[PDB]
Homo-oligomer: A and B are copies of this chain.
Amino acid sequence: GASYFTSVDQSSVHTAEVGSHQIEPLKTSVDKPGSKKTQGEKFFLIHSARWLTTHALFHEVAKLDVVKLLYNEQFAVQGLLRYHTYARFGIEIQVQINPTPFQQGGLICAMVPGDQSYGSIASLTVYPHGLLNCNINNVVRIKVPFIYTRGAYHFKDPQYPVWELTIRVWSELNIGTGTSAYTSLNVLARFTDLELHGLTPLST
């Protein structure tokens, strides 16, 4: 007797079993056997847009509900969230781009909890941020624990987004006549210390 789903039986009897767990002398697969971490605490490509010469300063290149985005069949983690009601966790975001050295400018990526409200765009550095500069780096990583008003996030029917990742133009992207006037961008996200609670058959 253990685990969930208990069974109470009056006219009981013993269990019949044969053989035991056989450990492969020659494994049929070398990858770590699926585990909470294997399928849940791994990276996934959330969103991906473009950044042009047209994009003026402070232009929001992307406003994402990191969490909500992950909750989608497209990603394996869904398989763990799709069957649990609540869940608390931490997040690690990784945003990367590929500007040609002939390009110049910069972007700022900040993990703002809940909503940007009316916070001064100029102080987005206060939040867990990552500054991108063409002449310097083309990638940034951010990791944050659980920050919410509630003790967990409700997937099936959320109250308010846990994280709203924002990406604005920190310094207009200008170039010399001839150079590509753009640069695609991608956003990677993953759960950390994924704590799942309450198994449910629901879906919405």
Contact = CB atoms under 8 A, between A and B. Distances in A.
Nearest to A11: B138
A155 interface: no
Nearest to A5: B43
Interface in A98-131: 128-130
Contacts of A145: 18-22
Interface stretch (A29-37, A46-54, A156-164, A175-183): A29-37
Measured as residues with beta carbon below 8 angstroms from the partner, the interface class of chain A is 35 or more
A139 B38 contact: no
A124 to B, nearest CB: 13
Contact of A39 (B83, B137, B192): B83
Interface of A: 3-5, 7, 9-22, 24, 28-29, 31, 33-39, 41-43, 80, 83-84, 86-88, 90, 94, 96, 128-130, 136-147, 150-152, 188, 192-199
A147 to B, nearest CB: 8
Contacts of A33: 36, 194-197
A6 to B, nearest CB: 9
Contacts of A14: 141
Contacts of A198: 29, 31
A86 B42 contact: no
B36 A3 contact: no
B29 A141 contact: no
A199 B11 contact: no
Given A9-B139, A41-B3, A90 B21 contact: yes
